[PDB]
């Protein structure tokens, strides 16, 4: 039932100037919860008592202390954030086996598997528009200025870890996951395509790592989902990026966009600008008609 390890070391988070234990979080009684459906330990749709839907993570029954404690702080770092653009918590249920989060349900699924599935092709040549793009980064900047003005560092923005409301039109951008945030608060995997020079080099991390991690995933937001830096490998990146090497535009960038990338990527992060300023960029494009009246690129495919 409840948790020894979560009990006995009983960690604190703090945010924002105020601190949070396992006591903080919403639990909710487990027979008010009903898991439907399998979404990709793992995540389905759930609804909680018309019931409220949610997307339930689970914690795996076979895991270490280690993996507790993990599950524990995300449950933690989320049910404190608290933005329109980052994923809501609406509770927990820690007393019962699997431990479930429960989470905002985010229909769209992954901002990177949503572009890829989503390109203009000849079956769906208006899919996508400029417009569409630019507002997903508005989205995810906006996410980002809340958490670096509560002096949050998320360290791993990129598209993977955002999620949509919902495929279609009227979609809203969210940032969905903190793990990396929650590993170190408490490498082959790290985020290194990602990463500003100083962070792989001294493990520095400030908010201007946050910057340069964004220019990354507008990036791959106006790539149509593209990993970074094509064909080369981490170590490749590494040494590109610490010499001064910058990916180029994706294919029909705007100039103004493009720029706002190159911007995010300054060698000093004194150099790059905050989200305040990436957010006033970014409405400038929007309200530019040569940007937002640029054609996405249409990827070769069948009619039906």
């Known amino acids: 039932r409840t948790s020894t390890i ?5 960690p604190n988070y703090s945010f924002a100037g105020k601190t949070s234990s396992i006591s903080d979080l919403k639990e909710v009684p487990r027979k008010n919860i009903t898991l439907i459906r399998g979404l990709g330990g793992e995540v389905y749709e759930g609804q909680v008592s018309s019931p409220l839907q949610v997307a339930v993570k689970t914690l795996p029954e076979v895991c270490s202390e280690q ?12 049910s404190k954030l608290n933005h329109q653009n980052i ?3 609406i509770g927990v249920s820690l007393q019962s086996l699997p431990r479930f989060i429960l989470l905002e349900l985010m229909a769209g699924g992954d ?15 208006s899919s996508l528009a400029m417009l569409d793009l630019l507002h ?12 670096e003005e ?22 809203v951008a969210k940032i969905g996951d903190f793990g990396m945030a929650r590993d170190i608060y408490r490498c082959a995997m790290l985020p290194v395509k990602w990463m500003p020079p100083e962070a792989f080099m001294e493990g520095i991390f400030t908010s201007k790592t946050d910057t340069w991690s964004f220019g990354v995933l507008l990036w791959e937001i ?18 590109f990026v610490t010499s001064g090497g910058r990916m ?32 006033e960029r970014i409405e400038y494009c929007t309200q530019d008609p040569d940007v937002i009246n640029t054609a996405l690129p249409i990827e070769y495919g069948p009619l039906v």
Not at 6 to 10: H, I, R
Not at 136 to 147: K, M, N, T
Not at 150 to 171: Q, S, V
Not at 249 to 276: L, S
């Open 6 to 10: 979560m009990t006995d070391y009983n």
């Open 67 to 78: 993996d507790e404690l993990d599950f524990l702080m995300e449950a933690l770092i989320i």
């Open 87 to 89: 994923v809501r918590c």
């Open 111 to 125: 901002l990177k598997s949503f572009l890829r599935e989503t390109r203009p092709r000849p079956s769906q040549p």
């Open 136 to 147: 997903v980064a508005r989205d995810i900047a906006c996410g980002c200025q809340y958490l």
């Open 150 to 171: 509560n002096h949050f560092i998320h360290r791993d923005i990129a598209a993977r870890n955002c999620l949509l409301t919902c495929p279609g039109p009227g979609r």
């Open 222 to 239: 106006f790539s149509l989902g593209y990993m970074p830096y094509p064909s080369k490998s981490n170590q490749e990146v590494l040494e």
């Open 248 to 279: 180029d535009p994706p294919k029909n960038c705007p100039g103004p966009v493009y720029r706002i990338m190159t911007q995010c990527w300054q060698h000093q992060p004194e150099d790059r600008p905050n989200f305040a300023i990436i957010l």
